[PDB]
């Protein structure tokens, strides 16, 4: 077998030259929903509360076409002793 261990890295300070989702701050919303006259993104309709929402698409010629599953990442976490 093996053995490994890691911790993380803090989110770089995202400047202002990008407006992202809400609830994902990483999507940037290229959609908007007329029901609830709020601006969304892919995720918001894929899965989101939109899941059968009446949205408007923004982009006329369709960006993304093809779709496929992204491999998922599994990782640990867990707080430990620390001192001052
Ligand atoms: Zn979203
Ligand atoms: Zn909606």
Do not use: W
Request: net charge negative; with cysteine.
């Amino acid at each position: 077998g093996s053995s490994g261990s890691s911790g993380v890295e803090p989110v770089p300070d995202t400047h202002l030259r990008g407006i992202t989702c809400l609830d994902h701050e990483n999507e940037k919303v290229n959609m908007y929903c007329v029901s609830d006259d709020q601006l969304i993104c892919a995720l918001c309709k894929l899965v989101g509360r939109h899941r059968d929402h009446q949205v408007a698409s923004l982009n006329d010629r369709f960006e993304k076409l093809k779709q496929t599953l992204e491999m998922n990442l599994t990782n640990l976490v867990k707080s430990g002793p620390s001192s001052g």
